[PDB]
Design a protein around this ligand. Structure first.
Ligand SMILES: [Cl-]
Length: 231
């Protein structure tokens, strides 16, 4: 157990702030809600504060707080994300969309007061203007995934590897290959994990009285051991 884990005991407010620029189409997203790490549960509504989101909402789910993952008792000694709190961690990804562009993201995840804040910069390049992403051809849904986590001893953080398959409106799938690196912001000790999985489940919806372009997300995330965590 870490000291940082103690910050997660009950329900914690979350603020997510994302500035994006994909093929020169700029946007901002703000997320508001709460996290319950005991149960591995997140409740968030995200609004595009610049008006129309120029990419599909499902392509931003992974970018838009793994510190709310439920680590079973016997895996708590492997929970990097909470151990890095309150000072927090940097999270970087390259997300490669098969036969289309790439997103590069850099986020800082830390507490500000009693709120957990995820502040992200996203830059996408090499997208097709007519493709599945800039052409909004993806279905509004998000399937369950398995994130593979490994220690990065030299950086005293973690790497993660996973694939997201987004359903396309014509019945095809759009792959998005995720490469991820996390490093702590503070100088204090953290917990480095053995290899494991995070098992994820996500429900996307709309708030019927919300006029702005938005996404309501319910997410469940639980850590799982190495033998069966792939499915
Ligand atoms: Cl969408």
């Amino acid at each position: 157990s870490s000291k940082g884990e103690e910050l997660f005991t009950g329900v914690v407010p979350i603020l997510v702030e994302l500035d994006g620029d994909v093929n020169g189409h700029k946007f901002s997203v703000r997320g508001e809600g709460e996290g319950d790490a005991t149960n591995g549960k997140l409740t968030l509504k995200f609004i595009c504060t610049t008006g129309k989101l120029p990419v599909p909402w499902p392509t931003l789910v992974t970018t838009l707080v793994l510190c709310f993952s439920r680590y079973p008792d016997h895996m708590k000694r492997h929970d990097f994300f909470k151990s890095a709190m309150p000072e927090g961690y940097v999270q970087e990804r390259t997300i490669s969309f098969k036969d289309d562009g790439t997103y590069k993201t850099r986020a800082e995840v830390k507490f500000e007061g009693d709120t957990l804040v995820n502040r992200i910069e996203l830059k996408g390049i090499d997208f097709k203007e007519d493709g599945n992403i800039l052409g909004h051809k993806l279905e509004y849904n998000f399937n369950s995934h398995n994130v593979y986590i490994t220690a990065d001893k030299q950086k005293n953080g973690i790497k993660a590897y996973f694939k997201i398959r987004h359903n396309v409106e014509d019945g095809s799938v759009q792959l998005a290959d995720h490469y991820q690196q996390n490093t702590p912001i503070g100088d204090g000790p953290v917990l480095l994990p053995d290899n494991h999985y995070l098992s994820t489940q996500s429900v996307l919806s709309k708030d019927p009285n919300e006029k702005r372009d938005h996404m309501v997300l319910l997410e469940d995330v639980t850590a799982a051991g190495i033998t069966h965590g792939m499915d």
